[PDB]
Amino acid sequence: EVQLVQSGTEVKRPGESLTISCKTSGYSFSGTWISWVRQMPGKGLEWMGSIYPGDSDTRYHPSFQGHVTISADRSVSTTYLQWSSLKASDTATYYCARSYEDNYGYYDLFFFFDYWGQGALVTVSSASTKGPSVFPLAPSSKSTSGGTAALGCLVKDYFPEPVTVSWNSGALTSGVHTFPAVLQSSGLYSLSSVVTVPSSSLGTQTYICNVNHKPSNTKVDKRVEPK
Amino acid sequence: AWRNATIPLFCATKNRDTWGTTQCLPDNGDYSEVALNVTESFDAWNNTVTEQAIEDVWQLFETSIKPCVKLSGSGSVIQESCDKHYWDAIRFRYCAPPGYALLRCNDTNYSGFMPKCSKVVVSSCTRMMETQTSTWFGFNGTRAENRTYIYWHGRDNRTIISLNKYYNLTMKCRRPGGSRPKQAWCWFGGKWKDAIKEVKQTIVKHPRYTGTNNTDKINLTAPGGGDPEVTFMWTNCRGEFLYCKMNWFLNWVEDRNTANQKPKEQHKRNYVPCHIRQIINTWHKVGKNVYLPPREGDLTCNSTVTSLIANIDWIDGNQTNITMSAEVAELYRLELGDYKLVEIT
Amino acid sequence: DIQMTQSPSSLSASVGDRVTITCRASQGISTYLAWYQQKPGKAPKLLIYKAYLLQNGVPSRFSGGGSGTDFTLTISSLQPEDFATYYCQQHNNNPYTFGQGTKVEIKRTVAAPSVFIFPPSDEQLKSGTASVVCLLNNFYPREAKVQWKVDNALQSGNSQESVTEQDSKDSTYSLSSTLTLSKADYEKHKVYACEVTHQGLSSPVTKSFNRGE
Amino acid sequence: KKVVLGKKGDTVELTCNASQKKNTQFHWKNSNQIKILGIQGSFLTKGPSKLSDRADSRKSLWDQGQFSMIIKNLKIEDSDTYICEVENKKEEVELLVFGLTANGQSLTLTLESPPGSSPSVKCRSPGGKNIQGGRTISVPQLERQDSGTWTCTVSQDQKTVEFKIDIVV
Ligand SMILES: *[C@@H]1O[C@H](CO)[C@@H](O[C@@H]2O[C@H](CO)[C@@H](O[C@@H]3O[C@H](CO[C@H]4O[C@H](CO)[C@@H](O)[C@H](O[C@H]5O[C@H](CO)[C@@H](O)[C@H](O)[C@@H]5O)[C@@H]4O)[C@@H](O)[C@H](O[C@H]4O[C@H](CO)[C@@H](O)[C@H](O)[C@@H]4O[C@H]4O[C@H](CO)[C@@H](O)[C@H](O)[C@@H]4O)[C@@H]3O)[C@H](O)[C@H]2NC(C)=O)[C@H](O)[C@H]1NC(C)=O
Ligand SMILES: *[C@@H]1O[C@H](CO)[C@@H](O[C@@H]2O[C@H](CO)[C@@H](O[C@@H]3O[C@H](CO[C@H]4O[C@H](CO[C@H]5O[C@H](CO)[C@@H](O)[C@H](O)[C@@H]5O)[C@@H](O)[C@H](O[C@H]5O[C@H](CO)[C@@H](O)[C@H](O)[C@@H]5O)[C@@H]4O)[C@@H](O)[C@H](O[C@H]4O[C@H](CO)[C@@H](O)[C@H](O)[C@@H]4O)[C@@H]3O)[C@H](O)[C@H]2NC(C)=O)[C@H](O)[C@H]1NC(C)=O
Ligand SMILES: *[C@@H]1O[C@H](CO)[C@@H](O[C@@H]2O[C@H](CO)[C@@H](O[C@@H]3O[C@H](CO[C@H]4O[C@H](CO[C@H]5O[C@H](CO)[C@@H](O)[C@H](O)[C@@H]5O)[C@@H](O)[C@H](O[C@H]5O[C@H](CO)[C@@H](O)[C@H](O)[C@@H]5O)[C@@H]4O)[C@@H](O)[C@H](O[C@H]4O[C@H](CO)[C@@H](O)[C@H](O)[C@@H]4O)[C@@H]3O)[C@H](O)[C@H]2NC(C)=O)[C@H](O)[C@H]1NC(C)=O
Ligand SMILES: *[C@@H]1O[C@H](CO)[C@@H](O[C@@H]2O[C@H](CO)[C@@H](O[C@@H]3O[C@H](CO[C@H]4O[C@H](CO[C@H]5O[C@H](CO)[C@@H](O)[C@H](O)[C@@H]5O)[C@@H](O)[C@H](O[C@H]5O[C@H](CO)[C@@H](O)[C@H](O)[C@@H]5O)[C@@H]4O)[C@@H](O)[C@H](O[C@H]4O[C@H](CO)[C@@H](O)[C@H](O)[C@@H]4O)[C@@H]3O)[C@H](O)[C@H]2NC(C)=O)[C@H](O)[C@H]1NC(C)=O
Ligand SMILES: *[C@@H]1O[C@H](CO)[C@@H](O[C@@H]2O[C@H](CO)[C@@H](O[C@@H]3O[C@H](CO[C@H]4O[C@H](CO)[C@@H](O)[C@H](O)[C@@H]4O)[C@@H](O)[C@H](O[C@H]4O[C@H](CO)[C@@H](O)[C@H](O)[C@@H]4O[C@H]4O[C@H](CO)[C@@H](O)[C@H](O)[C@@H]4O)[C@@H]3O)[C@H](O)[C@H]2NC(C)=O)[C@H](O)[C@H]1NC(C)=O
Ligand SMILES: *[C@@H]1O[C@H](CO)[C@@H](O[C@@H]2O[C@H](CO)[C@@H](O[C@@H]3O[C@H](CO[C@H]4O[C@H](CO)[C@@H](O)[C@H](O)[C@@H]4O)[C@@H](O)[C@H](O[C@H]4O[C@H](CO)[C@@H](O)[C@H](O)[C@@H]4O[C@H]4O[C@H](CO)[C@@H](O)[C@H](O)[C@@H]4O)[C@@H]3O)[C@H](O)[C@H]2NC(C)=O)[C@H](O)[C@H]1NC(C)=O
Ligand SMILES: *[C@@H]1O[C@H](CO)[C@@H](O[C@@H]2O[C@H](CO)[C@@H](O[C@@H]3O[C@H](CO[C@H]4O[C@H](CO)[C@@H](O)[C@H](O)[C@@H]4O)[C@@H](O)[C@H](O[C@H]4O[C@H](CO)[C@@H](O)[C@H](O)[C@@H]4O)[C@@H]3O)[C@H](O)[C@H]2NC(C)=O)[C@H](O)[C@H]1NC(C)=O
Ligand SMILES: *[C@@H]1O[C@H](CO)[C@@H](O[C@@H]2O[C@H](CO)[C@@H](O[C@@H]3O[C@H](CO)[C@@H](O)[C@H](O)[C@@H]3O)[C@H](O)[C@H]2NC(C)=O)[C@H](O)[C@H]1NC(C)=O
Ligand SMILES: *[C@@H]1O[C@H](CO)[C@@H](O[C@@H]2O[C@H](CO)[C@@H](O)[C@H](O)[C@H]2NC(C)=O)[C@H](O)[C@H]1NC(C)=O
Ligand SMILES: *[C@@H]1O[C@H](CO)[C@@H](O)[C@H](O)[C@H]1NC(C)=O
Ligand SMILES: *[C@@H]1O[C@H](CO)[C@@H](O)[C@H](O)[C@H]1NC(C)=O
To answer: Where does the Ig-like domain lie (chain D) (predicted)?
Structure first.
């Protein structure tokens, strides 16, 4: 099988250099164009450039010319994407993408992408690794109706992503809504995880958050109780 | 290290060696190739190897079946000694002279125009190539594989299509003996209906094709008029030149609705009537050759059918014609179009 | 530089429906267009190339058409796995460009949001900031307007929203709105109110609390 | 654009500069893009166009580098813009075909034209009386002084073509 395997997640600061990579297998690396594609958060796909490893011929989208360098090493079947000086605006997901191979030679007519890497998350920010503060969202008279009540936790001020949130060590899965994190003016991330449960159970059953943030190796378990 | 080169090549044969201006050396028997770690450009038409092959086949053509009179379009009438002793069509290979080498694109993606081939192999000589001359179809070719593929001119809509070996396509021509000295039959064997379907499916998938994707509107098309070598399929058997009327075969292979046709041409048959001619138009130079009356006896020739010569014609998205071609030279651009001559320097 | 314009940006349909997306090129690209499918958190997947050719393995319910500038992608009978975003891409003109996407989400009966509100915890107040969370649960369609009011004073520029992906089973959305203030400014006012507008509501609904009660 | 004028029922020979590498296919096509003539090797091909029955080329000049299209028995409908094509290098030529017919008494020289032309006529008579017009020339009362051959000239912008008609009464 054809496989494009990219390097892992990256967290850098503005001004630093960065090289991410993509190692291929299952086909003749030298005889097919391979490209890099950017997907900014919540946005579409942008073709950045491509290289024909067999002779180092390169192409760049006019908006990325001079800001990135694409290269390849045939001895290890790998293509590289390099920035000399990162900006915060370079924060996005980056995809390795191989051109369609069986093009009868017409790579300029069939310049579409049949195999993709898993993607690489690249975060560029001046912020520093920081674990989250977890605050309870206690159920109240203003979080209840029809015998069902809403409660949750506020996972605030952490960098970088991601954060995982469980409820009662995974025993509670129904009604849970863990929201996608937002980026604040401070440069730190926040998110909330809420769950609806029967009001009758508030007095009896205990509800605890399970917040893990591996980048800072912080695990937290905050109990959320009424009043 | 090398650079592209244009220099005369030397030919090599296994049995007979002389014809016209051409003289070949003995074949050494080595058909090995070595893989290279390089990217190179290949082109079956802009190619000194196939250009030279076309010239040597022309030299062979006029010495294998000897004409009695050569009529040039200039007006010269040239008589020559002629008999019914003919040379069979041969196979020969080309060999790079010292200081030169032959590259070859060893890639199934090769379609006769490849600005970047990264599966290059090198050798001193080429494969053996078939030298028979015909229109419409190619016979006894050496390039058939278990797939259909197209050499498509990089700057035109000229093509030559390699038919799939799987379908076992053949042609048996026979002019029975007497005691009808100038008329015969040619029988088309093999799974012709599937082979043509696969040709059309192959065209639909090709990056160069922007016509209809409805294969019911893609059709083998006989030329409407012109020289007889164009309107009939042109071939030879036992030193006699055959001209075959192909209407019934086209009706049959495409399963056409023939009601709108003259009654004589409404038939759908896998065999076709052919006739022998003594005056032919020459295919490589403007002129006419005159040959002796047909020989006596039973004339029979069994051939594989390995290629289809055609232009792919469309002006919109509603109809595509695979127009049968009399461009004899395309046969040899299929035979050797994957080679390139380079100067080892 | 060829621009690809996809219509519509979003579209709702049910299992078994016949859906068709459009893509238009700022100039003619002949028949050289590709379609991709992308699901959240995963790489694009090629479906069609050269406008009408299906990649190996793609189910036959996918079909493509068009030439010149107007192209379409059609799914004959939508299946559960087909709910995703779809991109077109012209693939014969350097630089190569994509459409901005067409999202295909599940259809359901309109459902108004359950509005809840959470005052800031005392732990957070002890730390120096206050976060008021407004929660809209299990609504449809996704469009919603959430305005904050502090003592009937409209707030602007100090709140952030987050929306879930459409749920798999009941096909609704949820949205969180978070108002952030100093502990100081939070103790200078009394009424904090979350005003929600949405199609399933004939008049905007409000959820409010009084500080310290 | 080059323009060539022909007389109805006559023959015309359009020319094309056939100078390029060997084994380059040349084509004569009409404006609707259907082929009329073509070269394949040293063979002549003729297309679906049913004008091809009256179309031919001069093979003696194929060596000197000329791909002519000769059309016999010209019809008014043969008027068209024809294209000599070779690997997407086109050279056009507009052919216009006219006919000049006839019928004390009155003479009426009528001119037959294809749709889109704007022709003029300038006839002379045996006696030297000139006369001009558009579609038709008229001499309402024939003098008998002019029975003979009328040298006429038909014009279309820069180019002209000459007719000769014999008249009695
Ligand atoms: C695509 O490829 C196929 C396959 O190659 C081509 O088909 C071949 O075409 C050749 C044409 O030369 C056919 O060969 C000819 O067959 C003639 C008829 O053969 C039978 O009858 C004769 C008696 O008349 C028998 O002697 C034959 O016996 C032969 O077969 C047995 C069994 O294999 C052998 O043991 C024998 O030794 C024979 O080989 C057959 O029963 C035949 O007359 C003809 O012979 C002349 O030409 C050959 C070739 O040089 C000479 O060796 C032979 O001595 C004869 O020579 C006469 O003519 C030459 C000049 O023409 C003179 O110089 C001589 O002095 C002499 O007078 C030849 O063998 C072959 O059968 C056929 N194959 C098939 C499968 O159909 C296709 O043409 C090709 N297609 C295209 C488009 O190119
Ligand atoms: C078919 O032919 C092809 C073509 O020859 C062949 O492919 C080559 O294979 C060889 C290995 O056999 C490859 O050589 C490797 O190249 C690696 C990449 O080198 C480049 O990148 C280096 C790292 O860049 C980072 O760091 C630098 C320095 O700080 C920084 O500038 C960059 O921005 C980036 O951060 C870089 O260091 C390197 O620069 C060196 O070399 C260049 C070129 O000569 C020179 O100009 C520089 O001054 C400097 O000397 C270059 O930019 C490289 O990392 C790798 O190195 C390891 O192996 C070698 C031995 O090979 C050790 O000596 C070395 O210590 C390391 O262990 C190695 O050099 C080559 O890149 C391939 N070429 C291509 C085009 O793919 C195929 O193998 C052939 N196929 C077969 C079957 O034979
Ligand atoms: C092999 O054969 C094919 C098929 O014949 C041939 O394809 C032609 O390739 C040329 C380019 O070399 C194309 O010409 C381009 O046309 C662009 C606009 O396309 C539109 O208009 C076309 C013109 O037709 C009009 O006039 C005719 C009468 O003359 C009339 O019948 C038509 O209805 C129309 O009014 C038209 O053919 C075309 O329609 C086809 O294609 C579209 C997709 O684009 C498809 O939707 C239709 O169904 C139909 O198949 C369309 O309406 C034009 O913008 C372009 O101009 C620029 O690009 C060229 C190329 O680089 C530059 O040279 C030029 O300077 C400009 O930059 C150009 O004129 C022509 O459209 C192709 N024809 C077809 C049918 O596809 C190949 O060339 C052949 N290959 C070789 C090697 O010879
Ligand atoms: C390669 O194959 C694909 C199919 O796999 C093929 O796709 C077509 O692409 C062409 C453009 O090249 C389209 O033509 C346009 O059609 C526009 C709308 O036409 C409507 O009607 C179509 C016919 O329906 C009737 O007939 C069918 C039987 O044929 C019958 O079952 C129906 O019930 C009905 O009676 C219909 O197919 C078409 O479908 C659209 O909607 C369906 C329904 O959802 C959807 O499934 C399709 O995918 C498609 O989106 C549609 O309903 C028409 O407006 C447009 O005309 C404008 O543009 C042209 C020029 O482009 C102008 O000349 C004209 O003046 C207008 O401005 C044009 O006619 C065709 O509809 C596609 N068909 C399909 C099924 O996708 C490609 O063409 C093939 N490529 C080649 C090169 O052959
Ligand atoms: C260009 O090249 C294409 C091939 O690439 C070629 O296509 C061939 O077209 C013909 C028709 O033009 C095809 O023949 C038709 O097939 C249909 C469908 O067949 C299947 O399905 C039916 C059920 O619908 C089954 O019964 C059948 O067994 C098959 O499984 C047939 O329905 C057609 O039959 C009618 O027309 C025939 C004329 O050829 C008659 O012989 C037959 O009796 C049928 O007649 C009746 O119906 C007609 C309308 O349907 C009506 O007009 C008649 O008066 C009468 O009532 C027909 O067999 C053929 O399969 C295609 N071949 C391939 C390989 O696809 C194009 O013809 C060609 N174009 C040109 C111009 O050459
Ligand atoms: C030597 O040359 C011969 C002649 O070319 C060649 O035979 C051909 O082999 C190919 C490949 O094996 C055959 O192609 C397959 O054909 C079937 C038949 O279906 C078609 O025809 C019917 C009408 O009879 C149509 O209704 C139908 O729509 C098809 O057009 C196809 O079903 C095969 O498709 C598969 O591959 C597609 C992608 O390529 C998939 O989209 C499709 O769904 C099929 O795949 C499925 O099964 C796979 C296996 O589980 C799975 O992995 C996929 O995900 C998917 O689920 C295919 O097109 C062709 O018919 C043969 N032709 C003849 C005349 O026999 C020999 O193979 C060749 N030999 C060698 C050694 O090279
Ligand atoms: C693939 O191969 C097929 C078959 O060889 C080709 O089809 C031929 O195409 C030509 C031109 O497209 C056809 O000729 C045309 O016929 C039309 C219909 O004819 C009727 O009407 C006239 C007038 O009333 C009658 O005299 C006649 O008897 C018929 O009743 C005509 O209308 C056409 O004339 C007009 O269009 C052409 C261009 O299309 C102009 O040049 C003319 O000046 C005029 O404006 C024309 O005569 C022919 O009939 C087709 N043959 C068959 C068997 O179908 C395809 O063209 C070819 N495709 C490609 C891409 O090469
Ligand atoms: C030119 O291209 C052809 C076609 O790809 C090459 O021939 C092919 O070579 C491969 C590799 O030797 C053969 O497959 C191999 O088979 C062995 C034995 O089972 C297996 O161990 C390998 O993993 C691989 O599968 C393939 O069968 C063969 N195909 C044909 C049609 O011969 C050829 O080697 C290339 N030439 C050069 C000089 O590179
Ligand atoms: C045919 O191939 C040759 C190469 O073998 C091409 O030659 C080059 O042509 C360009 C432009 O004319 C020159 O700048 C190069 O110096 C040529 N190289 C050599 C080695 O001659 C030629 O252009 C090709 N012809 C076509 C029509 O593509
Ligand atoms: C072609 O012939 C071979 C044997 O020579 C046979 O195995 C194969 O099945 C044949 N193909 C068809 C389509 O009959
Ligand atoms: C050629 O085919 C015919 C008919 O199938 C057969 O009789 C004959 O033996 C075959 N071989 C030759 C050399 O004619």
So the answer is: 1-96
Amino acid identity of C80? Answer: P
CB-nearest partner of A106 from B117, B118, B207: B207
Q: Tally the C-alpha atoms within 13 A of residue B50's C-alpha that lie toward its C-beta.
A: 23
Q: Of C150, C152, C144, C138, whose CA–CA distance to C177 is shortest?
A: C144
Q: What residues of chain D lie within 8 A of the CB of B313, using their CB?
A: 35
PDB resolution in Å: 2.3
Q: Is B220 exposed, middle or buried (0-12, 13-18, 19+ CB in 10 A)?
A: buried
| CB nearest to A55's CB, from B114, B116, B207 | B116
How many residues are given for chain D? 169
Q: Where are the domains positioned within chain C?
A: 1-107, 108-213
Tell me, yes or no, if A105 comes closer than 8 A to chain B by beta carbon: yes
User: B108 by DSSP, 3-state: which?
Assistant: coil
Evaluate whether the domain defined by A127-227 bears CATH number 2.60.40.10.
yes
* Direct distance between the N- and C-terminal alpha carbons of chain A, in angstroms, rounded to an integer: 57
Tokens 């998938």 belong to residue: B205
Are the Cβ atoms of B205 and C53 closer than 8 angstroms? yes
Backbone angles phi, psi at C103, to 5 degrees: -90, 135
Nearest ligand for residue D20 CA: 9
Fold of C108-213: Immunoglobulin-like (2.60.40)
The CATH code for residues B1-345 is 2.170.40.20
**Which tokens is B32 given?**
């090995």
Name the phi and psi angles at C126, rounded to 5.
-60, -20
Neighbours of chain A (3+ CB pairs under 8 A): B, C
Nearest to B113 among A31, A54, A105 (CB): A105
Output phi, psi for B63, to 5 deg: -105, -15
> Looking up tokens 């069979």, which residue turns up?
B88
Pair of tokens at residue A117? 């890497």
The experimental method behind these coordinates is: X-ray
For residue A112, the distance in angstroms to the closest alpha carbon of chain C comes to 5
Beta-carbon pairs below 8 A across chains B and C: 8
C53 at interface of B, judged by CB pairs closer than 8 A = yes
**Tokens of residue D79, six digits:** 């008027």
Which amino acid type is present at position C79? Q
CA distances from B44 to B131, B207, C40 (A): 17, 18, 47
Distance, CA of B306 to CA of B160 (rounded, Å): 10
Of ligand 4's atoms, which has the minimum distance to the CA of residue B212? 83
Give, as one character, the DSSP assignment of residue B95.
E
SS3 B62: helix
Q: Which atom of ligand 10 is nearest to the CA of B194?
A: 13
b vs e for D68-105, b when ≥16 Cβ sit within 10 Å of the residue's Cβ?
A: bbebeebebebbbbbbbbbbeeeeebbbbbbbbeeeee
- How far does B151 lie from chain A, in Å, by closest CA? 10
Measure in Å the smallest separation between the Cα of C52 and chain B Cα atoms. 8
Ligand nearest the Cα of residue B316 is: 3
Q: So where are chain A's domains? A: 1-126, 127-227
| Cβ atoms within 10 Å of D12's Cβ, excluding its own | 16
What domains, with CATH codes, occur in chain D? 1-98 (2.60.40.10), 99-166 (2.60.40.10)
- Residues 6 or more apart whose Cβ sits within 8 Å of residue A62: C1, C95
B4 lines ligand 9 (CB under 6 A): yes
